[PDB]
Design a protein around this ligand. Structure first.
Ligand SMILES: [Zn+2]
Ligand SMILES: [Zn+2]
Ligand SMILES: [Zn+2]
Lengths: 46, 62, 117, 151, 309, 67
RNA sequence: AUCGAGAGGA
């Protein structure tokens, strides 16, 4: 049930691999431009 | 190309109003960042990226 | 000596300023907006404590015991309720940067006792 | 050295530390904490120098004067030492915390940036961050002083 | 005929091509350094350029405070990647796991606070503020509360199940002053930290097992965040966060240091960046050498892209 | 990009062992066991095989310019 | 070729 110390070294890197498989590395730029082109332009126009 | 809907209503006198909606009026071309949701490379598999002479490992963001 | 706080007018709710009736020389507090005035009892107008000799326990609040950051100890029990646990920190304020005296706060709820050894 | 620093911290918390003339109580407290840590670092460096043998290449290049120094040997083998920013220890960048991994008002050597390990052993991540701060300060001084010196 | 797309198209193109962020006429008044040509020397250089930050303090400034590596930069900015020359301490690189908020509307949060015991500033008695707690959402004081502990617990609980409060929303309770701060705007840097129970990690073998077959049961990082075992903590929230470096720091010892940890790091090496993670055994090096390698990896020569033909 | 013909240090041929090394890897052999099977006794050649990435396969995905 | 900006090396 609990992550043992001899398995933590693998569990943490599995977690980090999941993070970098889902999010990416340029996610901040991608999401910022999506935010802009999606709601910011409409907010400006309105 | 960005298109904007424009609604123009003429008000002169005597309740002579009429709204003319100029649908999809061109306002300008917005540069599109690569790999974004409005780039042609969004969601494309690595095979399609290679078909379009683009690197699968290219992160975009530019 | 003690400190002096301001007084409010009962008519316009403005502060009473120091004033004096020469006839009786009785410390008066007269509001300078309207004609209202009052007779003082503190007999003190202004104090300036340079030594800032004040107790930090007054400024210490009892809700700080719920901070998961400050350290805790069981070697300084609360005198008010006998609880073993206590949360301690420094004064961490201006004019009190020195005097690393530890200020203890009781962890048990509804007590909140603040003290210093 | 850690036990001695704990003793100073306890004495300060018990108001048993009479300030030296010409200095404030925190000034005296820090000065003596840094004195204890510096004495420990010097002693451990001396121990490393004694442990060095005649075939050691570090010692060879140091005695020849070609490169390196006693402080470099000491930091490689025994103890890197205290990391200092603007002449003092690591400042409380957070609210009374050097890093969020410590507790508030913790003037222990580890919290304020005393790298306990050596380069050969490897530094713990807080020590790595503190050493990065020290190197950044050195780079800042190097990149700043040049214009004034040239003028 | 009345409209002109030329202004929009040409202005956007000019800004992105020259880097002067402003009007074309105010070229000298515009700020440079934005929209630089992408470095394609090597893949590490490209990634570092795409994850680059800067501070508009100016290279001529001789003040050492802005350039100093602040304690706050932990887990957000690489402590080694910085230009050696004039831009030292100003141009920065993102940490590996650092994510910065894209922004949201605080309307659901305000509605929930209204639903709770939060009292509007116009309705509160003026004398009810001394002993109560103040609540700030996106910087504007919206009311007072009398149970800050319960309110903070409830708000964290909502943030941990992808309710009206999204994960990126910041929620800082400062205790010395009774302020409670809720932040939702964009530009806030944050990183994922494992939540810690009474003394135990919330992440478990079930989560790790479901992550092992990440390609079969579509159990991903989004599910990890939804399950309430990982939380994005911004800078200001890190002040009230007690961080366990590793689960080894939660084990009971002969002397109790903290015993009240509220978060844990996924891995200490996440504080590094892109050109700093290439370094083997960086904890056995001197820091200026780490910085030199971080600058020098962008100059390393390899296959900068697969489609170089 | 492609497997070098010779080891840099000693000059022994390693350009005819990449496919066999991959086959051994797919045959559940450990990397060191495969290196021993291919007769790579020296750690220079062991490096030359173990540290090699094969970018020619990725480059072969893109269509040729001339048909 | 001129100006300006950016990235860099010692
Ligand atoms: Zn009055
Ligand atoms: Zn008590
Ligand atoms: Zn060889």
């Amino acid at each position: 049930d609990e992550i043992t110390p001899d398995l933590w070294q693998e569990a943490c890197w599995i977690v980090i691999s999941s993070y970098f498989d889902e999010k990416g590395l340029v996610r901040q730029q991608l999401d910022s431009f999506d935010e802009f082109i999606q709601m910011s332009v409409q907010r400006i126009v309105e | 190309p960005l298109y904007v809907d424009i609604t123009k209503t003429v008000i002169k006198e005597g309740e002579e109003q009429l709204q003319t909606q100029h649908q999809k009026t061109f306002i300008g071309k917005i540069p599109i960042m690569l790999r974004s949701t409005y780039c042609l490379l969004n969601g494309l598999t690595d095979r399609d990226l290679c078909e379009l002479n683009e690197c699968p490992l290219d992160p975009g963001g530019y | 000596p003690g400190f002096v706080g301001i007084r409010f007018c009962q008519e316009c709710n403005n502060m009473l300023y120091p004033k004096e009736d020469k006839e009786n020389r009785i410390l008066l507090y007269a509001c300078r907006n309207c004609d209202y005035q009052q007779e003082a009892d503190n007999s003190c107008i202004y104090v300036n404590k340079i030594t800032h000799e004040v107790d930090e326990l007054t400024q210490i609040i009892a809700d700080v015991s719920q901070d998961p950051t400050l350290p805790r100890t069981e070697d300084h029990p609360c005198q008010k309720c006998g609880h073993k646990e206590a949360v301690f920190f420094q004064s961490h304020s201006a004019r009190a940067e020195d005097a690393m005296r530890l200020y203890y706060v009781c962890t048990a709820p509804h007590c909140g006792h603040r003290w210093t050894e | 050295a850690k036990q001695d620093v704990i003793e100073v911290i306890e004495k300060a918390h018990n108001n048993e530390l009479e300030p030296t003339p010409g200095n404030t109580l925190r000034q005296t407290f820090e000065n003596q904490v840094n004195r204890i840590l510096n004495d420990a670092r010097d002693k451990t460096g001396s121990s490393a120098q004694k442990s060095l043998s005649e075939y050691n290449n570090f010692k060879s290049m140091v005695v020849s004067g070609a490169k390196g120094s006693k402080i470099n040997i000491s930091q490689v083998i025994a103890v890197v030492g205290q990391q200092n920013v603007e002449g003092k220890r690591i400042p409380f960048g957070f609210k009374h915390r050097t890093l969020p991994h410590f507790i508030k008002d913790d003037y222990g050597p580890e919290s304020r940036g005393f790298v306990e390990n050596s380069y050969l052993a490897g530094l713990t991540p807080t020590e790595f961050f503190f050493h990065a701060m020290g190197g950044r300060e050195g780079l800042i001084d190097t990149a700043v002083k040049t214009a004034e010196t040239g003028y | 005929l009345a409209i002109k797309t030329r202004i929009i198209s040409d202005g956007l193109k000019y800004s992105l091509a020259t880097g002067n962020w402003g009007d074309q006429k105010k070229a000298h008044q515009a700020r440079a350094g934005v929209s630089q040509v992408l470095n394609r020397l090597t893949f590490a250089s490209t990634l570092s350029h795409l994850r680059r930050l800067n501070s508009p303090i100016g290279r001529d400034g001789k003040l050492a405070k802005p350039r100093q590596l602040h304690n706050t930069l932990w887990g957000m900015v690489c402590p080694a990647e910085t230009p050696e020359g004039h831009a030292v301490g100003l141009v920065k690189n993102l940490a590996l796991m650092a994510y910065i908020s894209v922004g949201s509307q605080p309307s659901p949060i305000l509605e929930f606070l209204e639903e709770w015991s939060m009292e509007n500033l116009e309705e509160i008695s003026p004398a009810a503020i001394a002993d109560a707690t103040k609540i700030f959402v996106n910087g504007c004081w919206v009311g007072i509360h009398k149970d800050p502990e319960q309110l903070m617990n409830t708000l964290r609980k909502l943030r941990r199940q992808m309710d009206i409060i999204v994960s990126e929303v910041s929620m800082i309770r400062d205790i010395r002053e009774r302020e409670i701060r809720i932040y939702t705007d964009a530009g806030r840097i944050c990183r994922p930290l494992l939540i810690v129970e009474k003394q135990k990690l919330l992440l478990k073998k079930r989560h790790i097992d479901q992550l092992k077959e990440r390609e079969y049961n579509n159990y991903s990082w989004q599910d990890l965040v939804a399950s309430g075992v990982v939380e994005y903590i911004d800078t200001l929230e890190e002040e009230t966060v007690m961080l366990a470096m590793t689960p080894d720091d939660l084990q009971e010892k002969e002397v109790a240091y903290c015993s009240t940890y509220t978060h844990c790091e996924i891995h200490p090496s996440m504080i590094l960046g892109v050109c700093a993670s290439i370094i083997p055994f960086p904890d056995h090096n001197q820091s200026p050498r780490n910085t030199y390698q971080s600058a020098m990896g962008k100059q390393a020569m390899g296959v900068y892209i697969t489609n170089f033909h | 990009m492609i497997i070098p013909v010779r080891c840099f240090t000693c000059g022994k041929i390693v350009g005819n062992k990449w496919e066999a090394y991959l086959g051994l890897l797919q045959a559940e052999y450990t990397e060191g066991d495969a290196l021993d099977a291919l007769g790579l006794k020296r750690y220079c050649c062991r490096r030359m095989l173990l540290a090699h990435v094969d970018l020619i396969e990725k480059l072969l995905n893109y269509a040729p310019l001339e048909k």
